Amino acid sequence: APSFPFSRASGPEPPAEFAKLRATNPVSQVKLFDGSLAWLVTKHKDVCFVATSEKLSKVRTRQGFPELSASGKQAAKAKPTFVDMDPPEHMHQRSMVEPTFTPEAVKNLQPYIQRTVDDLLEQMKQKGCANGPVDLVKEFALPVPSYIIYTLLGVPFNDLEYLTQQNAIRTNGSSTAREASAANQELLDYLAILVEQRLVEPKDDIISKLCTEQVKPGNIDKSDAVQIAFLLLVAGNATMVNMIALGVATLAQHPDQLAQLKANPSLAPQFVEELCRYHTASALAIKRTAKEDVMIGDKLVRANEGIIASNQSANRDEEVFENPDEFNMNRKWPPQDPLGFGFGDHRCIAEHLAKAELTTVFSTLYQKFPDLKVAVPLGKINYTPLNRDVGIVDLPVIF
Ligand code: HEM
């Protein structure tokens, strides 16, 4: 049983193991850091099965759950939020904050997403590059998703820059465990104060809605509200930052596509669709434990055994996506859903918001900076460690 997670074949590529497994052993056992075993599912149809089967559980207190790291096993001890719940608890809590993320709500949020992007671009422009290239991640990819979610949660404008920096420290590879936990506790402390404040004088934000609709009636307590707000903040932020950076690098990598996008920003939506399929920046979030025996392919997964369903592999499944390893914004899409945001009840709560942010970014970036260019050989791009999810640490650009 090979050790898992696997390492990316190279900076921008997925682990080489998946293609081989999809062809010769689509459902196989892998070995986790603690020596335990787990079933790895690599085919699109099977990943969808795991994501929706009622015989599988997301509860991390179940023996057999596939924790992939030492830290993961520790976090599994904290009280759970909806990300780690099964029905009926799952939707009972998730529906408390879903309103803000509906397709309709996100459509109404579009002008705000656009002004946020426009302002950040203007700041990056007036920040010039006269004395050298700028780091597109720090100056743009990081603040876009950060300012948006923080603002949606209820954070005041003046605190955005500092809070964006602290949240980044949580996941920065350079941060020490101490600095990471310190930033973590700090954000939690800050949200606690926001909840106390909003309980007294509610405003138009997620935290206020939680306080008024759930804390006051007694449906959840203050700490619960804090944890839910924290989940929404930390869940997909770092992924959003990486997707934006990955998007720019990909366009640099494929001049033809960039030319087409520049000529027709209306293609932004399809570019984003292909990006979320091609670069599956969140590939280790579909995990379960079997509540009872379940058959998947030619394998029997016994009760209490763990399962990891790779949506990254599913997104390269040649049986669903023709020429899966080719980035093609003009790709002819199959009836099957790409799985960059998961599948089933747990499907990313912010999928529509995420796509709206990316679409806004790629329909505006090259309009503002037609000559935007990565100011370093593409082969030198600073990617996240190969043993981690795909992403980019920093990206020097000129425009
Ligand atoms: C391009 C960026 C993003 C990607 C690629 C992404 C991907 C994912 C994936 C793969 C899952 C697992 C879904 C499943 O269990 O099937 C997920 C869950 C989740 N994401 Fe995201 N996400 C992104 C952005 C966001 C943002 C912006 C937020 C925060 C506002 C967010 C909040 C969450 C939450 C709370 C869950 C858990 C949902 C549940 O279990 O019910 N995501 N995301």
Side-chain angles (χ1 to χ4, degrees):
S3 293
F4 186 87
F6 299 144
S7 288
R8 311 208 301 281
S10 74
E13 305 183 283
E17 290 90 345
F18 295 149
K20 285 158 208 186
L21 291 167
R22 282 195 310 277
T24 71
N25 206 15
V27 187
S28 66
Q29 285 188 298
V30 293
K31 204 197 174 154
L32 308 188
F33 84 105
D34 56 4
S36 63
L37 292 171
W39 289 99
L40 172 67
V41 171
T42 64
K43 297 238 59 168
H44 186 286
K45 64 170 148 159
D46 295 331
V47 165
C48 286
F49 172 81
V50 172
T52 63
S53 178
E54 311 86 339
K55 288 157 168 196
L56 308 183
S57 169
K58 276 219 79 186
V59 174
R60 303 166 63 170
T61 60
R62 288 196 171 250
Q63 178 151 7
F65 188 87
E67 297 291 355
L68 311 178
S69 71
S71 63
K73 211 135 158 202
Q74 242 126 18
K77 318 309 199 99
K79 181 186 167 136
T81 51
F82 70 87
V83 64
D84 299 322
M85 296 178 173
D86 284 341
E89 298 81 21
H90 177 238
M91 278 319 304
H92 174 72
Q93 186 176 98
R94 173 162 161 153
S95 66
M96 293 177 179
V97 297
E98 230 159 20
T100 297
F101 305 91
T102 72
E104 173 86 306
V106 171
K107 281 194 212 142
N108 290 337
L109 270 179
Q110 187 46 219
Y112 159 72
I113 298 180
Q114 184 66 246
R115 46 174 155 263
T116 298
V117 164
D118 286 348
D119 293 353
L120 249 7
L121 283 172
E122 176 47 40
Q123 271 158 224
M124 183 175 81
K125 167 207 201 236
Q126 76 188 341
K127 198 251 168 31
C129 57
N131 289 305
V134 302
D135 172 21
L136 182 132
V137 175
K138 192 208 171 300
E139 314 298 333
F140 187 69
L142 166 61
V144 165
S146 303
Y147 284 25
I148 289 176
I149 192 57
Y150 269 134
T151 292
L152 285 185
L153 287 164
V155 169
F157 184 81
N158 283 133
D159 302 347
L160 291 179
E161 173 161 15
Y162 176 75
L163 262 17
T164 288
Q165 163 187 83
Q166 297 314 279
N167 177 233
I169 285 159
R170 291 184 74 262
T171 55
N172 287 336
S174 65
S175 306
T176 69
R178 259 232 261 144
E179 297 166 335
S181 45
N184 205 87
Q185 221 4 277
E186 173 173 26
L187 295 172
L188 280 166
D189 279 356
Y190 182 96
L191 291 175
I193 287 313
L194 247 190
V195 157
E196 297 290 356
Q197 267 177 225
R198 293 316 189 255
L199 268 174
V200 177
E201 187 42 68
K203 303 292 205 233
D204 215 299
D205 49 45
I206 299 176
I207 282 154
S208 292
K209 298 187 176 25
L210 278 175
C211 291
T212 289
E213 311 164 13
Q214 314 295 340
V215 183
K216 286 197 180 152
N219 299 339
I220 68 175
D221 54 34
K222 284 189 296 199
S223 45
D224 291 333
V226 170
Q227 287 296 135
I228 289 169
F230 189 68
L231 168 58
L232 292 173
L233 191 225
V234 315
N237 204 73
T239 305
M240 261 308 313
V241 181
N242 275 327
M243 287 304 289
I244 289 171
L246 253 5
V248 181
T250 302
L251 284 166
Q253 236 101 204
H254 307 302
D256 189 31
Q257 323 249 337
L258 177 51
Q260 301 172 56
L261 184 63
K262 271 193 228 173
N264 184 12
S266 258
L267 298 167
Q270 42 195 81
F271 168 75
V272 168
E273 279 307 313
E274 180 68 335
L275 180 72
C276 293
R277 170 200 77 85
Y278 188 89
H279 282 312
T280 300
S282 172
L284 306 164
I286 313 174
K287 307 188 296 178
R288 309 273 193 284
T289 298
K291 267 149 58 177
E292 60 183 88
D293 281 17
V294 64
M295 293 160 194
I296 305 174
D298 65 4
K299 298 302 190 318
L300 168 71
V301 177
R302 300 171 53 186
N304 309 303
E305 289 201 324
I307 308 161
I308 295 143
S310 182
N311 51 323
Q312 168 174 54
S313 178
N315 280 339
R316 304 290 193 111
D317 194 338
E318 49 288 322
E319 207 186 315
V320 170
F321 303 110
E322 189 163 22
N323 301 114
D325 296 330
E326 159 182 303
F327 186 98
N328 183 7
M329 86 189 281
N330 306 297
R331 149 174 321 271
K332 203 167 157 191
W333 294 91
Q336 294 94 329
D337 278 6
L339 309 179
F341 294 91
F343 202 71
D345 298 347
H346 282 275
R347 189 162 176 152
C348 190
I349 193 171
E351 181 176 8
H352 312 298
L353 172 62
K355 289 204 187 165
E357 292 188 25
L358 294 168
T359 297
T360 300
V361 161
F362 291 105
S363 69
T364 312
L365 180 60
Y366 301 95
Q367 211 65 215
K368 175 91 179 180
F369 306 119
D371 304 309
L372 181 80
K373 158 200 236 173
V374 176
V376 102
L378 297 191
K380 299 278 176 195
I381 286 161
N382 191 6
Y383 292 100
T384 50
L386 296 192
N387 70 337
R388 295 284 168 260
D389 273 307
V390 62
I392 290 172
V393 176
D394 71 83
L395 191 68
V397 295
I398 40 145
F399 39 83

